[PDB]
Amino acid sequence: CPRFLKVKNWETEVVLTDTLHLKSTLETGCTEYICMGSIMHPSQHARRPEDVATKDQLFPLAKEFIDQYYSSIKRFGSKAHMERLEEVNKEIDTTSTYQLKDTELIYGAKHAWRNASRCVGRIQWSKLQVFDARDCTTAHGMFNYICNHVKYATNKGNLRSAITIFPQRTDGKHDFRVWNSQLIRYAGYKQPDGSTLGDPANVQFTEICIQQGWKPPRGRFDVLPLLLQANGNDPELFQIPPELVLEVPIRHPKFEWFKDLGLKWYGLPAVSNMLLEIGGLEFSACPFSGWYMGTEIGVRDYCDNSRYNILEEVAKKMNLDMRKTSSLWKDQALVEINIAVLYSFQSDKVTIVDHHSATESFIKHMENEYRCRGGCPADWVWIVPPMSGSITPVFHQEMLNYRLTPSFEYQPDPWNTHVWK
Amino acid sequence: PRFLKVKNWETEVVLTDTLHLKSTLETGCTEYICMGSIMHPSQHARRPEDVATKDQLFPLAKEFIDQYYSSIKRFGSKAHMERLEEVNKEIDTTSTYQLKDTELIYGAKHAWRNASRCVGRIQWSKLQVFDARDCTTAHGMFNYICNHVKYATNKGNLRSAITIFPQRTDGKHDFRVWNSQLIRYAGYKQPDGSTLGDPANVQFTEICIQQGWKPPRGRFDVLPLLLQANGNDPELFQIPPELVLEVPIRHPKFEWFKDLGLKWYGLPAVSNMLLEIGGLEFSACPFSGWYMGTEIGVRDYCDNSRYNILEEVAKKMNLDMRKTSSLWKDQALVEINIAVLYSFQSDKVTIVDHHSATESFIKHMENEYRCRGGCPADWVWIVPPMSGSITPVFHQEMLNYRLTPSFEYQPDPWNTHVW
Ligand code: HEM
Ligand code: HEM
Ligand SMILES: Cc1cc(N)nc2cc(-c3cccc(CN)c3)ccc12
Ligand SMILES: Cc1cc(N)nc2cc(-c3cccc(CN)c3)ccc12
Ligand SMILES: C[C@H](O)[C@H](O)[C@H]1CNc2nc(N)[nH]c(=O)c2N1
Ligand SMILES: C[C@H](O)[C@H](O)[C@H]1CNc2nc(N)[nH]c(=O)c2N1
Ligand SMILES: [Zn+2]
Numbered sequence: 001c002p003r004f005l006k007v008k009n010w011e012t013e014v015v016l017t018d019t020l021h022l023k024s025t026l027e028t029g030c031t032e033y034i035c036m037g038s039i040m041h042p043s044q045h046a047r048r049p050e051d052v053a054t055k056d057q058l059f060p061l062a063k064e065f066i067d068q069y070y071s072s073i074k075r076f077g078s079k080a081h082m083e084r085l086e087e088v089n090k091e092i093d094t095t096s097t098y099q100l101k102d103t104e105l106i107y108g109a110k111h112a113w114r115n116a117s118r119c120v121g122r123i124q125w126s127k128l129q130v131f132d133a134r135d136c137t138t139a140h141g142m143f144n145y146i147c148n149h150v151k152y153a154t155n156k157g158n159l160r161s162a163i164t165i166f167p168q169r170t171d172g173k174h175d176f177r178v179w180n181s182q183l184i185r186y187a188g189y190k191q192p193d194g195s196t197l198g199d200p201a202n203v204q205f206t207e208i209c210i211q212q213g214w215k216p217p218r219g220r221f222d223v224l225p226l227l228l229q230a231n232g233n234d235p236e237l238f239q240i241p242p243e244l245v246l247e248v249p250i251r252h253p254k255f256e257w258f259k260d261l262g263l264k265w266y267g268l269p270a271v272s273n274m275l276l277e278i279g280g281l282e283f284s285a286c287p288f289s290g291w292y293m294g295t296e297i298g299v300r301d302y303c304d305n306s307r308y309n310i311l312e313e314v315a316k317k318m319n320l321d322m323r324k325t326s327s328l329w330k331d332q333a334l335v336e337i338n339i340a341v342l343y344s345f346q347s348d349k350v351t352i353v354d355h356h357s358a359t360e361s362f363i364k365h366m367e368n369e370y371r372c373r374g375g376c377p378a379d380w381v382w383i384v385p386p387m388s389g390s391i392t393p394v395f396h397q398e399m400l401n402y403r404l405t406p407s408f409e410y411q412p413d414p415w416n417t418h419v420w421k
Numbered sequence: 422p423r424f425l426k427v428k429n430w431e432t433e434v435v436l437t438d439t440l441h442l443k444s445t446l447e448t449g450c451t452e453y454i455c456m457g458s459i460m461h462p463s464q465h466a467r468r469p470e471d472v473a474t475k476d477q478l479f480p481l482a483k484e485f486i487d488q489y490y491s492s493i494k495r496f497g498s499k500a501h502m503e504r505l506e507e508v509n510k511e512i513d514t515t516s517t518y519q520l521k522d523t524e525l526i527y528g529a530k531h532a533w534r535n536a537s538r539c540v541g542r543i544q545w546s547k548l549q550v551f552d553a554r555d556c557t558t559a560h561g562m563f564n565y566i567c568n569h570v571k572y573a574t575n576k577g578n579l580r581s582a583i584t585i586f587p588q589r590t591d592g593k594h595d596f597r598v599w600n601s602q603l604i605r606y607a608g609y610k611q612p613d614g615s616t617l618g619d620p621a622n623v624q625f626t627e628i629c630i631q632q633g634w635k636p637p638r639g640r641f642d643v644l645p646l647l648l649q650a651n652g653n654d655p656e657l658f659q660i661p662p663e664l665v666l667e668v669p670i671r672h673p674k675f676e677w678f679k680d681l682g683l684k685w686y687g688l689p690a691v692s693n694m695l696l697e698i699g700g701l702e703f704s705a706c707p708f709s710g711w712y713m714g715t716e717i718g719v720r721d722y723c724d725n726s727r728y729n730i731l732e733e734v735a736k737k738m739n740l741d742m743r744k745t746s747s748l749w750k751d752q753a754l755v756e757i758n759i760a761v762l763y764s765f766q767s768d769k770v771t772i773v774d775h776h777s778a779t780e781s782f783i784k785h786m787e788n789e790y791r792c793r794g795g796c797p798a799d800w801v802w803i804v805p806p807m808s809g810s811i812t813p814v815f816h817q818e819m820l821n822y823r824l825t826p827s828f829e830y831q832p833d834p835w836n837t838h839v840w
Contacts (some may be wrong), residue, residue: 001507010460010726011724011726013466013723026453027453029455030454030455031451031452032450033441033448033822034444034820034822035448035450035456035457035821035822036425036819036820037455037457037800037821038801038821039820040428040430040818082458178826277825283556286500293649294746299810301701303811304431305431325776325777325779326763326766326776328755328762330776330805330811331811332755332759335748335752338751339747342746354745354746356750357746380457381458381801382799384809385809386809386811387808387810387811388750388751388754389804389805389806390719390720390723390724390807391731391750391754391807398458398459400455401454401455401457401458402452402453402454402455404452413489
């Protein structure tokens with residue numbers, strides 16, 4: 001409970017003072033005697049589907065958000081503010097829920113991004129195209145909204161960050177869900193001999209898709225179909241029009257052989273399995289997209305052992321000594337791979353940001369947030385890039401982590417909870 | 422209050438922590454705010470003003486004695502009872518107490534064991550403990566330190582060691598090694614605003630000069646020892662040069678690399694921390710191991726506020742340094758770390774690469790969970806400063822918590838000492 005918490009940057013000596021943490025809403029997982037800062041999903045970053053808020057629970061949550069909204073537009077205590085409070089309250093009282101105004105929906109989505117501790121790209125938070133899909137009733141409808149989102153966001157390579165928001169949760173038996181973890185991801189296939197074709201991360205969902213009727217090409221980079229659930233009904237399959245899926249073949253500025261590896265990736269990162277919470281309301285289907293930081297593809301997607309795992313093959317074509325770890329052959333290959341990814345995206349004029357630029361922008365964003373907001377919650381474990389950590393400025397930047405609402409939350413995979421019709 | 426699980430997202434192995442239930446010190450976090458990236462929260466530090474009392478001391482003493490006799494399977498033995506008795510009579514009549522030699526060794530090993538930020542802990546029980554609690558003067562300190570340095574260097578076959586000087590009494594009679602490490606390079610603020618040598622040590626260097634040290638004013642001048650005994654003014658000593666093992670850094674492919682004139686010392690020996698055991702505080706306890714290559718190759722050489730050599734190397738590598746997206750820094754960084762490892766190895770000086778070390782640490786965790794019910798570990802420090810996610814610790818969930826005996830931070834003595 002101290003009113004002021006300070007963070008230091010150990011490279012610049014800049015010290016920042018945080019007061020925003022006083023507005024913190026939920027638990028982190030940590031206590032006085034233990035820190036869970038490297039735990040990926042503590043119980044508080046998640047949202048179980050059947051605990052739907054009671055009337056009594058929802059009132060103060062809505063009011064909290066409404067007050068925050070009118071505060072932001074400098075109309076706090078105003079007649080419109082008081083009238084909105086009364087309306088929401090009356091609405092909660094007679095329907096056990098309430099509907100957000102368009103302005104509020106837009107404000108809440110933007111602030112869930114602004115509040116996202118683990119996102120290094122938040123300097124962009126105020127530029128977010130919000131698509132209101134709350135009139136959607138069927139999975140065909142969801143498919144139509146998602147196609148339009150993908151096309152708008154892709155913009156022929158000049159990517160624009162966007163979110164599409166489907167109807168909020170009601171009784172929890174009528175959820176809208178995108179079963180895909182991202183709108184665009186490649187299939188993975190377990191072979192009888194134990195090997196994996198395509199993306200090992202997506203094996204389970206790929207199998208579900210095939211069970212649901214999807215005919216798989218069974219290649220290395222097969223774009224998965226959308227698996228879409230409207231109003232708690234069984235999910236349904238749709239092929240994304242291929243012309244809407246922008247891809248980049250990976251080549252290297254110096255190594256002519258690099259193109260022979262046959263690698264490519266998609267331009268549009270679009271996470272679709274998270275939950276958006278605004279004023280106690282739960283939007284279980286809210287796909288959002290931006291553009292890539294190169295390391296997300298070049299370090300994690302490609303060089304993770306449980307992913308495409310290409311380090312060995314790259315090192316071999318580089319004719320490195322792969323006998324001792326102390327030769328840093330993995331490190332050497334890792335850099336070249338990330339060079340190729342950045343180079344291939346820029347060459348095709350597809351928006352991408354390197355981890356040096358992104359982290360420097362983030363430090364500037366953080367400083368501005370401390371100034372204009374009283375703080376900026378940040379998760380160092382996620383903010384620091386997966387390669388070259390200490391030669392980026394976020395490595396030396398102390399951060400405070402805490403949960404502000406509106407927020408994006410994890411939710412359980414829908415196939416674990418769905419009551420099949 | 423529960424059994425907590427940690428998952429490794431690469432191997433899917435799940436460990437169960439019960440050891441955290443034993444912890445007594447605070448971490449810095451609360452239920453609503455995580456401070457896992459704060460370098461020195463109020464709880465990892467030890468101010469000399471905060472000296473114990475009879476009232477505070479015995480419970481801490483009993484706690485440690487109890488854990489010691491449990492570790493040697495003699496909890497509640499006649500020896501255990503008598504020891505508790507002995508320690509209380511002693512705190513009564515002296516306001517403190519002295520550790521048995523067995524206790525001191527046990528205490529130092531476990532301080533290392535419990536160091537949540539140290540990736541080298543698989544080695545924790547291989548520690549040479551030098552008891553210097555009979556020391557009374559800075560000359561005595563220097564002698565002990567020379568012996569430490571000589572033993573631990575061992576002609577390049579490095580051996581872990583710690584030397585323990587007398588414990589804090591009233592706080593006016595502290596023993597302190599003013600150096601941050603036993604062996605470090607000097608830094609000099611140049612007239613033209615820049616820094617010659619190591620910028621990390623500019624302040625300490627100035628104090629050495631102010632105290633009479635005659636600086637060679639080079640890029641790698643070994644600093645003098647500056648030694649404080651029993652609260653007296655610190656005294657300067659030159660470590661005999663034949664005791665200081667150094668490695669010239671060269672590259673296995675780049676013949677021009679040796680021409681950069683880089684070198685480093687072989688023995689990492691941190692001397693500015695505080696060892697706490699059974700409520701007693703050891704303000705001077707230099708301890709040494711061997712290097713993980715990134716400590717030198719990534720942080721020492723490439724931190725902006727350190728030797729800052731990336732530009733030079735990339736220049737010699739003829740890389741395109743106009744766009745960050747060419748990853749020219751990342752390239753130069755890998756090469757420097759290749760050189761460092763290759764140089765130490767060629768000179769048969771003990772060193773470990775970050776792949777090997779993170780690998781050993783994961784095995785260590787598994788060992789500790791099995792035999793101890795957990796291992797406190799600080800992901801922020803454990804993950805190496807380069808190539809993080811291609812080392813196994815990146816994907817290892819870790820719980821951080823504070824066990825005692827511990828190593829703690831303490832304020833630099835020049836911020837307190839009255840001359
Ligand atoms: C505009 C360019 C953007 C960039 C460069 C960017 C960058 C990143 C990166 C690199 C990560 C870590 C990814 C990983 O390790 O898997 C991340 C996480 C995240 N991003 Fe951003 N992002 C961008 C846009 C957005 C947008 C538009 C939103 C939402 C409206 C968003 C919300 C999030 C969230 C909620 C997380 C972490 C989720 C969690 O695990 O808690 N980002 N971002
Ligand atoms: C034997 C080989 C050892 C290796 C390879 C090793 C490795 C490391 C590394 C890489 C760090 C991080 C340093 C930094 O980032 O600046 C570290 C920190 C640390 N080491 Fe070890 N170490 C070793 C031995 C020891 C010994 C012998 C002790 C004490 C008896 C020790 C106690 C500590 C402590 C207390 C810290 C962090 C202090 C803090 O900030 O809380 N280590 N070690
Ligand atoms: C919008 C956006 C842009 C971008 N460049 N990266 C993103 C990464 C995530 C993300 C969050 C949690 C887990 C994972 C694992 N795949 C990814 C979410 C949104 C992102
Ligand atoms: C024994 C040993 C071996 C080794 N290889 N590294 C070490 C690093 C530290 C350390 C602790 C806190 C801050 C810093 C800042 N440079 C360094 C302590 C002991 C070490
Ligand atoms: C701000 C941050 O806590 C600080 O830069 C830390 C991060 N992780 C580190 N990790 C190690 N091993 N050593 C360090 O000095 C640091 N510094
Ligand atoms: C165990 C650890 O928390 C886990 O591997 C985290 C570490 N940091 C990360 N950081 C980012 N940006 N993305 C990740 O997926 C992870 N994974
Ligand atoms: Zn924490």
